[PDB]
Design the sequence.
């Protein structure tokens, strides 16, 4: 709802691409990772998502990882 | 041309994704809906586009729907 | 690294889509063109990339083409 804290996030690939997401602060990042792989034509097993150098787990949320609005998640291809 | 009113629009999926479009104010939204389905790997029959709760028809234009620059179109998956 | 000049670029298709990239100023635009075709579901032979009306070659870089931060590259479908 409009009463949640939504956080804007940028997902930046090593290929230069920057894709935007907006999700609630307590939403598991699996939501974003699955969406990203589906929409950008990538497979989960071939890419790795990291934030401030640490890999992001399925149930990690922006709030849990202490993300702030407009933070960037890095994507590496494997 | 540079003499038209171009409107920036955000298309926000229920999956958290936010995809940007820029089209002239009198352009039918079919342009955006087809482009979105092609580029994001979605099929038209499986997604529904709405603006301020109302479904968007093929020939509806941002001007006709009284959209403003930076408005958001919502996408639901079916 | 953080000591390079990274340039934000927008790639605007004739279909209204606007896709964002961030690459170093001396990086060949082949990086962006390949990424764009892969992610947006397009084939290189079917699209043409231009900047200020001139086609972009594989090894052209934003700096070489005298691009500035937030410039737009145009994409035409063939």
Sequence:
């Amino acid at each position: 709802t409009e009463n949640n804290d939504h956080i804007n996030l940028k997902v930046a690939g090593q290929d230069g691409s920057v894709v935007q997401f907006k999700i609630k602060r307590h939403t598991p990042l699996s939501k974003l990772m699955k969406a990203y792989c589906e929409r950008q034509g990538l497979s989960m097993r071939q890419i790795r998502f990291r934030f401030d150098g640490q890999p992001i787990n399925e149930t990690d949320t922006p709030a849990q990882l202490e993300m702030e609005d407009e933070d960037t998640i890095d994507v590496f291809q494997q």
